[PDB]
Symmetry: D2
């Protein structure tokens, strides 16, 4: 019953060239669906439709209160279809059903948060420094927005972009990862049910290498919003520059998990596993870089390694499963290549580091949860985002050394500090160059607070009021209420 | 008594290669000063010093209240030295001394505004959706910032960047236009008198082609703030992408001056001259594109042309001067080439369009104030920013047509609507895709309100609270106040 | 099927003394229902329950997001029960069913607005002027709130108080007008369906003279929020002073309707009728004081008078009815007494000023729509709030005189300016000492914007962000992160 | 050289009846100065002048930027005259010169803060839920404000009221405590030097019993701002009610100083002395109610008592003095009466509790620093604000009991928690019903953050943005841009 087509200008349409793509379940590498594989001309048509819709004013000039009501209706549909959406996300991405349910709860809350925010702030009145003038700043929708999402949390990442775009009155063109389009197709069906003016929302399906440059480089786009890897992000930004187009980027990280000797030890072990291995480490927020105080380093490594051996791999639909497969053959190959890099530069693969042998896992894209030890900040395995079920462990002596090491990367997305000394944790948090810092927690983020990176982890923010602001533009309207001639130029 | 050197890491220093540049007065093309012409290694040293200073915390961890007091001290020095600063700006850039005084008054007010804003907003407390958590957003200085300014309003543009950078606790590296460094050198001397930690402020002098790429592309930069032309801006953005560096750009415009038939006619003529010819049209806010309602078009053209013939050209130091020279041989040549373009595509040079013949103007870079008529939106002369003492005049029939034509450019910086029907002016203002819209005024902007462009006129804002926000970064600190093990992974 | 009891500490309960009150329909003066008439001990028990619930934290420490979801659920129930609620409001208060439907649409929007606002703040991070300190302002629910509403728009006024109280996490005790409790009982039934912790919400039914002083004067109350008349409001404020309790008051007005000679004349006549006679003038926002420019005063009076003669009086349930009865015998008597005052001080009753004679209106509390002319600012009829279907008409010569007269009252709630000259309307609006000014409109207010009075019209605001803020209290938490002894006192 | 007169409507004037008052130095009870003792007619004249000035618009319509510049000029004058002002405050109030210097530094910062805030927020643009409307909220000065200050920190408390009143464009009438007018007279002289429109600022000198009711009860007042005791505050609020006038009250407190067994012990002793005895305990922020964990109660009492015996009493001008005299005979008598109350209800005067005998202290209004032990929450000595150099000590067993006891008073101004367990201190801080909570500090407050009380400690806030907001009023201006007749009433 799921659509196999793109959604352009109010219609479900095939690709202009009738091409298709088979979508795969990473658990067994079986084809689960076939969808349209769109062309660059389809993408251009969608952008032009979005522009036409924006200029018509049917959505952009709708009242903010009414826009909020429609975004709330989307939220309710997510909750109504929570089970089926979660199952589809697990089928498409491989992560556990429980993880998918949590995603759907978050997605409902994202739409609901932005629904509520829609009508809360139209700008400001400025006390003008010029007598006999009125000065106001009006906040308008930024315009036409292109939105590109990755394969790890397809619908969650889509919601972070769609909700504020709709709440503010923008028109959008979204393109999900070509290998994971299923939930994004479904959410477009649900949005269509709610009802938006023709051209306000558009869904393109296809390879980034075919349609991506149109989405980032088109002159009618006012904002490109992208979540993915650093290489694609940089390429998008350079293409966006051709029209001086606003960019919002979230590009992953090398997130430190800092564990002091006065941490609650079993909590720290639990959260080190959570940070490292949820969704097989395929998370922008993954705690791939463990920094542990020297005094407890050996204790910690032994404890972590013993637990990693017990992680239950399997089908995301099976209730006992703790960790599913990685997303694709290409991604598994990349993780495997990093194991070779790590060994060649002198690190130790303490546990894991290979494909599992078990019969029920042999047809899937599984990779064992892995701990890499005896490494240092100079190493590629420590500096680079592997985005797999892999953590490195480094020791540190002092609070100052923990901070130095944690900040010694090109990234700046998120991190954690574990210590029962809250004063110390707060000092460390203040010094980490990260968009989010958790004190005695991990992977906590939500619609109410902005998420994004310092340094190469991104530009701008998603979620919160700051997330909504990516979709607004300020206009200063200054009215002279007693205009007088300047009489500078001779008469 | 003015310094001839760069200011790097608390010391006035020559270029690493001892190279120098002769600075010219455009009124007579005479050499007025000789300054150091820095190298890319000087720029890198400055950026590294800025980073070191930032990490030291001496400025970034100073209280916001005290940072505000120092910014206020800069403001007071500008006012103290108003006369000498104005004279330097007029010598270096050619605009009238009266215009330069107005600039110094504005600059005082910019510093004073940001001094007052420094300690007014450290972030937010978030009502977390997770029980037993505290969520806060702390706003920190963005980090190390590079600041590149143009030749038209050197100190004014510098102040828009320096003031918020210092107020927020950033370290900065500034590079003024190579052809107009004098007031920027002077302001650095004044800042040095106020006293800032070593490395907090740095001044590089040199050609954009030699040191610009280091300033935009260095890994230790967190924000590149640029004001200038679109070609350089796009280039900067592409280079900034290499490290996913934030950019704030202001790139000029094709600003419409919309004159309805129910405008106060003599006011509209006065403001059309002001929009077209202040600083010989070398203004990001210049009203180069006049759109006049058809019913008064002939009346308007005759009136404007008659006034343009009376504009007094001369030395900026002479009180009777209404318009000085353009900035350089290269810029005058560009303006001259546009006259040829306009004629070839079928427009009429109604008045001006050449160098003036008068003896006292023959040694200077003068160009006559010009009105181009019988043109249309398809023409290069109408679409492209000439940045000279040149306006085009197009007619429109309806309010809808005025909006369409005004929005028919790649730019989106500022514009005006002249009409005694305020309701109509407000309708038009709401539909113009411009960062600033004046109703019955022109060239009005000030520290209290954000300034910047839609579309190819820029990214981000300068001035106002939004201007300060370019120099901040948000950090979400989430504390779990009752941490519990998740117990997801097997034990 | 409607409850007849109070709702105290999670239970529907009779009065402690078993007393009751008969509720009347003003259209026919028939008894329509009988409810409990509570005692001062019931009110005290409710306040103590509200305090106990607040201290338990079950609502006050619930997440803001979840509080918002519950307030949204109340909003949806209002819409679900729109027809029955509207009919009950018309039965109890006499206004037209069409007016009641509009109320129910507004009430839905009030709850929805506050539902969406619930989780959008939390407080601020302050950049502290003291080194080695953290400064934050946390916004908490104000505490226990008592809420007292009037008989004119019972559920609408209740919604303005309940929505923000619940959104912020307060516990509340509400007492509707003793003569119009029906829709307030119903909304409590609906809130019970949504589910709130025992003691969070409480409904007291009874005479202000019996239970009012407890509600305003109890030591466990943190805010008293009252909407009604000036005499009761002043009494409440004086009683609240005994515990230095916050007060939010809205006390009606003497609202000017300013009509210039360049107003759209038929619009001004239409809106003068709307301002004067909706709900038989029993509206805090009624335009009871018409100020009309002398040049059109005769034209205006004749046009208004001719229309007033055509106003259709009748049963609020009948679709042709334009104006229902007034609320009670006591109120009709008050209005009648004002007619005598007006004549005695020299004014003219130009039309109306008595009970209508028609057979179908004889059993109801009807009073004819009335226009009073030949009056001036010195008169009681002009200065005092009659709160009936009565308007006075005064002339003014100039814009300056209009402002002077409009501001010449003890009140300051709302007003309008009618003029096609928007600049003039804006000048006047800026000078009027009124919480709301309409330019070319009347009776426009909504959840998104604050409503309240200057001068004797009130203290504080309802609706908007400022309305929510009445229900919050600020706490500055300052942590010294490197505490040192002061060593002032000798050792 | 100091003025002896009132300042009314731009002129220094004596009392209407030529009455005067002798001002005393509490160190030696000698007459130090004689000032005018104004009449209620003088107060009325000042209020009418303030109203006339407000309506003139000369200050209320001045640009916010310029108002800020003038407030900054006042700040600079305070710093310029720091020495003389500090000496005058010490002469008039008795506190140490070092304390007075700190006050003057704080006062400079208060004026500077508000100077910087003046032009930062003129209101909001609202996204209206009604099509074809514009909705804006303009923030105006509240109007005419009366300001009444106490004798303990005369100029500091005056600055908290004057600075925001002037920044926002209000007109003000200030009346300092009749017994301590000196620095308030001086600051009026300084303000006059800056220059404000006639009637914008006014100073009344006299007994609260003679002129106070006019200041709180006059119909032309829009806000009464009072800092003092609860009895006077309640009386002011009841009088203000006569015109439904806004009130801002700060009425002192029973501030808890909570010391856990895991506090830094010597820090806690130091801060218990600071909280109890600065300005001889005559501070709204005094830590008069010490709550100490039972486990360390005996240790703490002995350590505190031993230190209290060493406190150096003397002349505020002498550098070795740690504590000066109390303010007046009447106040010393009140403190003495409380010693009798404490003993009669069963408490122990552990140290102090009498006038000192030493020869150099015999002519002054000295009272020994006192510690009261063996008391409980039921006692008047624990519940009531003594406002002298007196602390009570109660024990608590648990964190829960500490919170219960601390919240068991009618007040709610400020308090502290001392514990090295920052998580615990934060839990306690969140549960205390206090406007300010210090974690490991005491007496820390500043212009950047709001100060005020829950419960009987006050209404509203001073300092910070919220403090400025007491001096603003919101006006919703709603413009219908396409007005249509409603056609409800028959034609
Ligand atoms: N931040 C995150 O959540 C996240 C998610 C996925 C991957 N990554 C990182 O990126 C690495 C590479 O992953 P990847 O290559 O599979 O993902 P990617 O960075 O290319 O992101 C994929 C998305 O970008 C699109 N895309 C590709 N080329 C584009 C182009 N030229 N223009 C516009 N869009 C284009 C894809 O079609 C897809 O929608 C991963 O190993 C990981 O380190 C991060
Ligand atoms: Na898939
Ligand atoms: Na970045
Ligand atoms: Na030059
Ligand atoms: Na742009
Ligand atoms: Na009734
Ligand atoms: Na009032
Ligand atoms: Na004194
Ligand atoms: Na109170």
């Amino acid at each position: 019953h799921l659509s196999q087509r793109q959604y352009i200008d109010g219609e479900w349409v095939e690709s202009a060239n009738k091409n298709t793509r088979d979508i795969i379940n990473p658990y067994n590498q079986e084809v689960i669906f076939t969808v349209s594989e769109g062309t660059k001309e389809d993408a251009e048509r969608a952008i032009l439709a979005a522009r036409r819709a924006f200029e018509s004013g049917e959505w952009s000039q709708e009242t903010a209160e009414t826009r909020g009501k429609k975004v709330r209706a989307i939220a309710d549909k997510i909750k109504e279809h929570r089970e089926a959406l979660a199952r589809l996300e697990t089928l498409d991405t491989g992560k556990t059903l429980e993880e998918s349910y949590a995603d759907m709860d978050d997605i409902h809350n994202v739409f609901m948060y932005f629904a509520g925010l829609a009508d809360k702030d139209g700008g400001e009145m400025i006390d003008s420094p010029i007598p006999d003038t009125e000065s106001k700043i009006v906040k308008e929708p930024v315009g036409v927005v292109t939105q590109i999402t990755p394969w790890n949390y397809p619908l969650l990442q889509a919601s972070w972009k769609i909700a504020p775009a709709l709440a503010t009155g923008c028109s959008l063109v979204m393109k999900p990862s070509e290998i994971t389009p299923l939930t994004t197709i479904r959410v477009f069906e649900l949005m269509e049910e709610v009802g938006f003016p023709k051209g306000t929302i558009n869904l393109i399906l296809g390879a980034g290498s075919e349609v991506g440059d149109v989405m980032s480089g088109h002159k009618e786009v006012d904002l490109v919003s992208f979540t993915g890897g650093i290489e694609t992000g940089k390429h998008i930004m350079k293409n966006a520059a051709n029209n001086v187009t606003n960019i919002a980027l979230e590009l992953g990280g090398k997130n430190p998990n800092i564990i002091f000797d006065d941490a609650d030890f079993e909590l720290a072990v639990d959260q080190a596993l959570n940070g490292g291995y949820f969704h097989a480490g395929q998370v922008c927020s993954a705690g791939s870089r463990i920094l542990v105080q020297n005094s407890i380093k050996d204790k910690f490594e032994q404890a972590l390694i013993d637990r990693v051996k017990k992680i239950k791999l399997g089908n995301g639909f099976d209730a006992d499963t703790e960790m599913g497969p990685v997303i694709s053959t290409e991604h598994r190959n990349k993780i495997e290549s990093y194991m070779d890099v790590a060994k060649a530069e002198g690190a130790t693969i303490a546990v894991g580091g290979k494909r599992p042998d078990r019969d029920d896992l042999k047809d899937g894209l599984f990779f064992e949860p892995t701990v890499i030890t005896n490494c240092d900040t100079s190493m590629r395995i420590v500096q680079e985002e592997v985005f797999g079920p892999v953590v490195t462990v480094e020791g540190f002596e002092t609070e100052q050394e923990a901070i130095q090491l944690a900040n010694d990367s090109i990234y700046g997305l998120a991190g954690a500090v574990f210590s029962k000394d809250i004063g110390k944790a707060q000092r460390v948090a203040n010094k980490l160059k990260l968009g989010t810092v958790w004190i005695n927690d991990f992977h906590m983020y939500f619609a109410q607070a902005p998420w994004g990176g310092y340094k190469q982890s991104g530009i701008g923010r998603e979620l919160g009021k700051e997330g909504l602001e990516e979709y607004l533009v300020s206009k200063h309207i200054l009215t002279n209420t007693n205009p007088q001639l300047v009489n500078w130029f001779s008469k």
